[PDB]
């Protein structure tokens, strides 16, 4: 690893600087290096890892969608070739993230908050692979299984307003609607998540209340689009 010679603390510090500088590819490289030191990640460090790769793959997904739309309309080799280039790079980033989760973040996650976070990430990165897949069936099943295991743990171990639990349910609902062709499942999950969070807000501080309601707004926004 190109980051093998840098101290763990220095990698984390530089990931935070890269975030402020909007240098997300650098941020992801620093956080991959930190993960590869073999120690568990704190909550803050898990958030840095997630932000970095979400931004990298987000740009790739946005580009792929533009190119796939151009390719569909035109139906020379250039559009297909360039779409394939972007697709391959996106798949490579997803495979890198999934590799970090499998070697060895998930197995070493020795409490529910960490394990849920990583299983949610696993679902997310299989979902991104599914967006470009044609197998697609196997990828969809891997995403669903990761998300469902995360949901089972989150329902036993976290309150309904916990932001990781909320974000997991949100993203699993998106999986159902956009990937699995299961819009009824998406709507049911978003609705139950929203209602159970609503009924738990009374337990929260002003700060946690703002945290939770921000994510609940996204559940509401999807339900408005889907119904």
């Amino acid at each position: 690893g190109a980051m093998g010679s840098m101290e763990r603390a220095s990698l984390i510090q530089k990931a935070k600087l890269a975030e402020q500088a909007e240098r997300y590819e650098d941020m992801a490289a620093f956080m991959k290096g930190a993960v590869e030191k073999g120690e568990e990640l704190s909550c803050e460090e898990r958030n840095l890892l997630s932000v970095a790769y979400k931004n990298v793959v987000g740009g790739q997904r946005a580009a792929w969608r533009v190119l796939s739309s151009i390719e569909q309309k035109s139906n020379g080799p250039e559009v297909r070739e360039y779409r394939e280039k972007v697709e391959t790079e996106l798949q490579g980033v997803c495979d890198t993230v999934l590799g970090l989760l499998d070697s060895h973040l998930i197995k070493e996650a020795g409490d529910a908050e960490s394990r849920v976070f990583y299983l949610k990430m696993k679902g997310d990165y299989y979902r991104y692979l599914a967006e470009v897949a044609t197998d697609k069936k196997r990828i969809i099943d891997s995403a669903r299984s990761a998300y469902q295991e995360a949901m089972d743990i989150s329902k036993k171990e976290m309150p309904p307003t916990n932001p990781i639990r909320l974000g997991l349910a949100l993203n699993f609902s998106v999986f159902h609607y956009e990937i699995a062709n299961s819009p009824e499942e998406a709507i049911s999950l978003a609705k139950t998540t929203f209602d159970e969070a609503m009924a738990d807000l009374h337990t929260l501080s002003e700060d946690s209340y703002k945290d939770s309601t921000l994510i609940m707004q996204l559940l509401r926004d999807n339900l408005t689009l889907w119904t």
């Binding site: 609902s173 998106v174 999807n222 689009l225």
Partner: peptide
């Protein structure tokens, strides 16, 4: 398009 976690 559906909105995922931000």
């Amino acid at each position: 398009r559906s909105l995922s976690e931000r």
